[PDB]
Amino acid sequence: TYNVWNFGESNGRYSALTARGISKETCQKAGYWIAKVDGVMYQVADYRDQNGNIVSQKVRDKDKNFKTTGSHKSDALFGKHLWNGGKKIVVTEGEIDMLTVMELQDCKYPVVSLGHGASAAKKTCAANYEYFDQFEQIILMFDMDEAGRKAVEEAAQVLPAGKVRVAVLPCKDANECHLNGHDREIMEQVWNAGPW
Amino acid sequence: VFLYHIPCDNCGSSDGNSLFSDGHTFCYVCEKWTAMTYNVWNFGESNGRYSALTARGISKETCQKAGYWIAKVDGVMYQVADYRDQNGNIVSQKVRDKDKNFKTTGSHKSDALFGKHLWNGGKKIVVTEGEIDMLTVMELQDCKYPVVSLGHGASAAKKTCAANYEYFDQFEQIILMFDMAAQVLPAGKVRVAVLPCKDANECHLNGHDREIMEQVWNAGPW
Amino acid sequence: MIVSDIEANALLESVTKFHCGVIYDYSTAEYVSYRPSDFGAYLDALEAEVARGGLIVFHNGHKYDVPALTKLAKLQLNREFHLPRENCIDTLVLSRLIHSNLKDTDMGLLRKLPGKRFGSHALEAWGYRLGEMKGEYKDDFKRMLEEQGEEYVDGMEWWNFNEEMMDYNVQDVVVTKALLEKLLSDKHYFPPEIDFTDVGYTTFWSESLEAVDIEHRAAWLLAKQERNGFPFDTKAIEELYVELAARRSELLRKLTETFGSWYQPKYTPVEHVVFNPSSRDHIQKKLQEAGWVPTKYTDKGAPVVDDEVLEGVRVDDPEKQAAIDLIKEYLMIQKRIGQSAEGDKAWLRYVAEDGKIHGSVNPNGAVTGRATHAFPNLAQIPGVRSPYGEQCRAAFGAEHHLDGITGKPWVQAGIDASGLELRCLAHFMARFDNGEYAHEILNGDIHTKNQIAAELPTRDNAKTFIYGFLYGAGDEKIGQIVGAGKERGKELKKKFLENTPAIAALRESIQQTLVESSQWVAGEQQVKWKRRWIKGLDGRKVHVRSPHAALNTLLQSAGALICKLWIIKTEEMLVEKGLKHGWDGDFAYMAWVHDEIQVGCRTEEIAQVVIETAQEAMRWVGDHWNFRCLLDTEGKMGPNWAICH
RNA sequence: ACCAGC
DNA sequence: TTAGCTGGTCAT
Ligand SMILES: Cc1cn([C@H]2C[C@H](O)[C@@H](COP(=O)(O)OP(=O)(O)OP(=O)(O)O)O2)c(=O)[nH]c1=O
Ligand SMILES: [Mg+2]
Ligand SMILES: [Mg+2]
Ligand SMILES: [Zn+2]
């Protein structure tokens, strides 16, 4: 609510996520950090523009509340600044689904994440139609729900021409397939999938 | 929970004092235990005593564990009932006296229940409408099988009962006792009981208390 | 000989997933670890160690660890996997017989242990006692989640696999190995002429004592009958609860109008306190202020109040004379409710989905080899002589298990031994009176003719009196059995001491064997010991707690072992006869209280075969140890455990 | 301290 | 000088 939270006024620390299964070097590469404000420990994601200039945080508490730290745009993807080329991206849905694929692929293939979810994906896909003309394929990795299939069917409309391929999961989404040991499936569903 | 016996350092036995996992002791010889208005009525402010309701019939430990305390401010006799939340915090109250001066103090939420800060898992729950009927069922069952009651009377059974859905989803069977019924509670999980008197207290004050306990365990389907 | 440790997701009641496992070997010295995807390799390693003729060392392996593997290997990858019981050994069943006394030696060490681990045979407590403990998984995981910030939900941290689980599993198998070396470093049970880390399953079992073999067989069988359960009727106990919960809510209404309320001193602050009949202070006060003198002072300023002084109490007011009986009935109803349905360990809070009760049975919990029963205690439900007793034992039946192939109920057989410790006495003192006492026990019933000779009212009172006299009473505690004074309490002692003058000679023999000097203090006793232990029937060092209970720990510790071998032999004959154990076979054990057994079987002919072969098993027990007496049992047949008492 | 059991 | 071996209960 206040500003971009400086780390010095929030006692910034980069560590792992033991309940989720993500190391410290992945969270160091992305920007996902842990702060101590008002006593209660808060996890906080760190957005940037395409240049790399810091404009927004997003804070979740011990029971997953939402705390936005300013003007939350629609042309801001989680980790958009990290990649400016390549041949494939894996558009996830949450923010730990981005970290999980950066863990299971060792920061090699580009992975970006959306800052709204399945509520306004089209709003942040049609307004991000100009970022995707520097890649070659798009592998949509959404939730395996009614809302996930609805979001991928409505979001396969305002993406670029015919490059969209949709990967399927046996879990709810990617992090439970990481926790239950299904690291063999999501390494195949990135490489091949069933199209529109 | 119980661990073992320690020697009692005060009364001087050998296997009398019992030590528990929470860090407290208890002796079975000396019986020693060791270790709106928008203004919540503080218990030391209002000369609060946990007396009994003799003309209705309710012990003292029921009023202690359910939080139903008598206030003696202004030289008069209030019966203040505390409502709570899941964390164990006083949120709102109800002040009542003989003239039904229902002074609802504190931030009275829209979906508050009376006696929900005690119970999370189980097979049964008995939902009544008032407070004296809820205390009556806790008198018969000795304060150990779950009984909650509505915080807005019998006119918010579609509002107070509806906003608590994930709370009543935690249990396997929900039993109603209103006035001799709601369906926003989940499907196939609502039983409705039939009594011969006006409510539970009238069955308690005439010897028909068996027909209270017989309808808790053998209630029919909705 | 390998030492292997498992880690899975939950308890044996509901387990569906394997997480990790570590194996150490005594021939290659290798911490061969495994992963969640190497469960087939784990099972192949264990089956190779079985097939070459070795021993697998678990910890708490008979109860949890081996049937967890048999459940997971079926319902995760569809393969049968059974370990033969002569290959799996445990290091908890060994600890419960070698270190059978921790509560009396654990003081002086509590400086090491936290305080919650006082007298625990768990694997972490031996990690604190061996001074080899590097952290704890639950504490470090809770601290790590508080350090990230996500909450700690339910105390369930075996949901997801990680690396700290494998690390503390490696430390777990370190603690198991360091316990096994000390447990095999004992000389009274394991002779120091052979190394027990390379011998087979025909040398390890039969080149040592018999108490190391009978205890593992007993742990195997009692874990199996724990996995079977006890069939239970829920509707017939809810009817009882709804019956006698509308009686203690009448015995307080009818009683508070008789015994009125009073002001109690909390300017003098008073409170309007009412009569609570469950308290033994309010009844004491209201009987003092109504004209009653106790004339019995156990406490230094307070009387004693129980069922034997609430009978012999008289008051002037003839209303209170009737009210005292309602007070006693209220205390009885309160205890029955708190045992049956409202306690923390009630019966209706330990009923599984399939309508059965699973209670833990520790095979060696007492110092004298007697099993203890817990969670819930199925050894102390009310008998058929107490009020509301038959209605409580009729729910614990074996006819409440309708068959899964024909839809028919089963039959129950119950077998009790007769005159067990009283016949072990005639075994032990037959070298003094030349065996002219062990002939009258075999000539007719003993307790009935003892009741005739002692003019007691009931056989149960004669049976209480004879053991009360035998296990070193005083002048008054066997006069109290008949209610009379210490004059009759002296003449009964003289009458049953002058009949057979060998009990005092046996007691003098035990005193000359164990104790050598006992200095006297006017308020205490200071004894220099010579042998604190007694060799039992199979070489086990039975610990003697007090020098006047030496006859007790000589009789009951030799009486428990013949029942412990009898319950093993009466299935070793039934499996070899051509039957099948379990619910999907022909018979199943249900409960083993201290003397009798309860078995439930499919047809009446199988009941007759079991009730025949129990006699042959008991006679083989009596022949294997060369008793000077002749052991004998008695069996009954019925639908439930009210006729089969 | 009380109750229940083997 | 002592009947014995267990479990289960409780209050701020
Ligand atoms: C009653 C009682 C029994 N016991 C012991 C001795 C008993 O042999 C053993 C089993 O108890 P019981 O089976 O009740 O006695 P019993 O087997 O000798 O007689 P019967 O079976 O013919 O009815 O428990 C005590 O130690 N103290 C006691 O107070
Ligand atoms: Mg283990
Ligand atoms: Mg017997
Ligand atoms: Zn005390």
Short mmCIF file of N, CA, C and O (backbone and C1' of nucleotides) and ligand atoms in Angstrom, two decimals, chain C residues 370 416-422 445 447 459 463-464 467 471 552 556 595, chain D residues 6, chain E residues 3-4, ligand 1:
data_model
loop_
_atom_site.label_atom_id
_atom_site.label_comp_id
_atom_site.label_asym_id
_atom_site.label_seq_id
_atom_site.Cartn_x
_atom_site.Cartn_y
_atom_site.Cartn_z
N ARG C 370 3.96 -59.59 33.35
CA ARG C 370 2.53 -59.52 33.06
C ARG C 370 2.27 -58.42 32.04
O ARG C 370 2.80 -57.31 32.16
N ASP C 416 -10.18 -70.41 30.06
CA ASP C 416 -9.58 -69.89 31.28
C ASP C 416 -8.85 -71.01 32.00
O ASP C 416 -9.32 -72.14 32.05
N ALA C 417 -7.70 -70.68 32.58
CA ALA C 417 -6.97 -71.61 33.43
C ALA C 417 -7.48 -71.51 34.86
O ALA C 417 -7.98 -70.47 35.29
N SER C 418 -7.35 -72.61 35.60
CA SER C 418 -7.96 -72.74 36.92
C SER C 418 -6.88 -72.96 37.97
O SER C 418 -6.11 -73.92 37.88
N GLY C 419 -6.85 -72.09 38.98
CA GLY C 419 -5.94 -72.21 40.10
C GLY C 419 -4.49 -72.02 39.72
O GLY C 419 -3.64 -72.83 40.09
N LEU C 420 -4.19 -70.92 39.03
CA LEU C 420 -2.91 -70.79 38.34
C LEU C 420 -1.77 -70.49 39.30
O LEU C 420 -0.82 -71.28 39.43
N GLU C 421 -1.83 -69.36 40.01
CA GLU C 421 -0.76 -69.05 40.95
C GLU C 421 -0.84 -69.93 42.19
O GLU C 421 0.20 -70.27 42.78
N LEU C 422 -2.04 -70.35 42.57
CA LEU C 422 -2.20 -71.25 43.71
C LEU C 422 -1.67 -72.65 43.40
O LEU C 422 -1.32 -73.38 44.33
N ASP C 445 -12.48 -79.36 43.57
CA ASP C 445 -12.24 -77.93 43.46
C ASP C 445 -11.60 -77.40 44.74
O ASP C 445 -11.87 -77.88 45.84
N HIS C 447 -11.28 -73.78 45.62
CA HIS C 447 -11.86 -72.58 46.23
C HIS C 447 -13.20 -72.87 46.89
O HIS C 447 -13.53 -72.24 47.90
N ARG C 459 -17.70 -67.62 46.82
CA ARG C 459 -16.46 -68.16 46.27
C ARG C 459 -15.50 -67.05 45.87
O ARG C 459 -14.28 -67.21 46.01
N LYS C 463 -11.78 -66.58 47.29
CA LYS C 463 -10.67 -66.42 46.36
C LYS C 463 -9.90 -65.13 46.61
O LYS C 463 -8.68 -65.11 46.44
N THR C 464 -10.58 -64.06 47.02
CA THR C 464 -9.85 -62.85 47.40
C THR C 464 -9.08 -63.07 48.70
O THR C 464 -7.92 -62.66 48.81
N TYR C 467 -5.57 -65.33 48.47
CA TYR C 467 -4.40 -64.62 47.97
C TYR C 467 -4.06 -63.42 48.85
O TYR C 467 -2.88 -63.05 48.92
N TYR C 471 -0.14 -63.38 49.97
CA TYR C 471 0.86 -62.38 49.56
C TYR C 471 1.14 -61.35 50.66
O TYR C 471 1.16 -60.15 50.40
N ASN C 552 5.53 -62.62 46.05
CA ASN C 552 4.70 -62.14 44.95
C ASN C 552 5.44 -62.21 43.62
O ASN C 552 4.92 -62.74 42.63
N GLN C 556 3.84 -64.73 40.72
CA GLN C 556 3.14 -64.27 39.52
C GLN C 556 4.07 -64.17 38.32
O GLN C 556 3.61 -64.33 37.18
N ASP C 595 -5.30 -64.03 32.36
CA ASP C 595 -5.46 -65.47 32.56
C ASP C 595 -6.10 -66.16 31.37
O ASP C 595 -5.60 -67.20 30.93
"C1'" C D 6 -7.13 -60.93 36.54
"C3'" C D 6 -8.23 -62.71 35.47
"C4'" C D 6 -8.78 -61.39 34.97
"C5'" C D 6 -10.26 -61.34 35.17
"O5'" C D 6 -10.55 -60.67 36.41
P C D 6 -12.12 -60.22 36.73
P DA E 3 -1.24 -54.14 54.55
"O5'" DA E 3 -0.89 -54.71 53.11
"C5'" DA E 3 -1.82 -55.54 52.44
"C4'" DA E 3 -1.10 -56.57 51.59
"C3'" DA E 3 -0.72 -56.10 50.20
"O3'" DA E 3 0.58 -55.55 50.22
"C1'" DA E 3 -1.77 -58.25 50.11
P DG E 4 0.96 -54.31 49.27
"O5'" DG E 4 1.13 -54.98 47.83
"C5'" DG E 4 2.22 -55.83 47.57
"C4'" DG E 4 1.99 -56.60 46.29
"C3'" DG E 4 1.96 -55.75 45.03
"O3'" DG E 4 3.26 -55.70 44.43
"C1'" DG E 4 0.23 -57.44 45.04
C1 LIG F 1 -8.48 -62.24 42.64
C2 LIG F 1 -6.97 -62.21 42.50
C3 LIG F 1 -6.32 -63.06 41.63
N1 LIG F 1 -4.90 -63.03 41.50
C4 LIG F 1 -4.14 -63.90 40.59
C5 LIG F 1 -4.13 -65.33 41.12
C6 LIG F 1 -5.06 -66.06 40.17
O1 LIG F 1 -4.66 -67.44 40.02
C7 LIG F 1 -4.87 -65.30 38.87
C8 LIG F 1 -6.14 -65.48 38.04
O2 LIG F 1 -7.21 -64.98 38.79
P1 LIG F 1 -8.60 -65.85 38.77
O3 LIG F 1 -8.75 -66.52 37.42
O4 LIG F 1 -9.77 -64.95 39.07
O5 LIG F 1 -8.49 -67.04 39.89
P2 LIG F 1 -8.35 -68.65 39.66
O6 LIG F 1 -7.94 -68.87 38.22
O7 LIG F 1 -7.33 -69.22 40.60
O8 LIG F 1 -9.80 -69.38 39.87
P3 LIG F 1 -10.83 -69.90 38.77
O9 LIG F 1 -10.22 -69.64 37.41
O10 LIG F 1 -11.07 -71.38 38.95
O11 LIG F 1 -12.13 -69.16 38.90
O12 LIG F 1 -4.79 -63.93 39.33
C9 LIG F 1 -4.19 -62.05 42.36
O13 LIG F 1 -3.01 -62.01 42.26
N2 LIG F 1 -4.80 -61.17 43.26
C10 LIG F 1 -6.14 -61.28 43.30
O14 LIG F 1 -6.73 -60.53 44.08
#
